[PDB]
């Protein structure tokens, strides 16, 4: 129950695996049947969202760091304020999602401590 937890992506089912051996560490979701795969950079994970156990609502959200200070221009020639990254995953076992939320926290805090 570490660096891997059967997670649902885009309403689809699959396993979510995390690898801290790569820099920046990333998370890869692999369908159950192997029809869909997803990859996410954990190093950006600025906030971890998880549904409480008491809440029948099963879900897990990942928040990626931003950089509005960059100030990107739009097609209209006007500056815009970029938005922060946010992923949405669904789990069936509070334990599995509990591991992901716990493991992910270890990664953020890992980079947070450095800075």
């Amino acid at each position: 129950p570490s660096h891997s937890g059967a997670a649902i992506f885009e309403k689809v089912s699959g396993i979510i695996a995390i690898n801290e051996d790569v820099s920046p560490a990333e998370l890869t979701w692999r369908s159950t049947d192997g029809d869909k795969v997803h990859t996410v950079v954990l190093s950006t994970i600025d906030k971890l969202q998880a549904t409480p156990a008491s809440s029948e609502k099963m879900m897990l959200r990942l928040i990626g760091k931003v950089d509005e200070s960059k100030k990107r221009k739009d097609n209209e020639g006007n500056e815009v304020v970029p938005k922060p990254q946010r992923h949405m995953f669904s789990f069936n076992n509070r334990t599995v999602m509990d591991n992901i939320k716990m493991t992910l926290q270890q990664i953020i805090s890992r980079y947070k401590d450095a800075d």
């Binding site: 969202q49 549904t51 409480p52 809440s55 029948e56 609502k57 879900m59 949405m88």
Partner: peptide, 14 residues
């Protein structure tokens, strides 16, 4: 329909 909708899932009700 909107992001706020999914956010409610975390708020739920006692």
């Amino acid at each position: 329909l909107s992001p706020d909708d999914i956010e409610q899932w975390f708020t739920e009700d006692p």
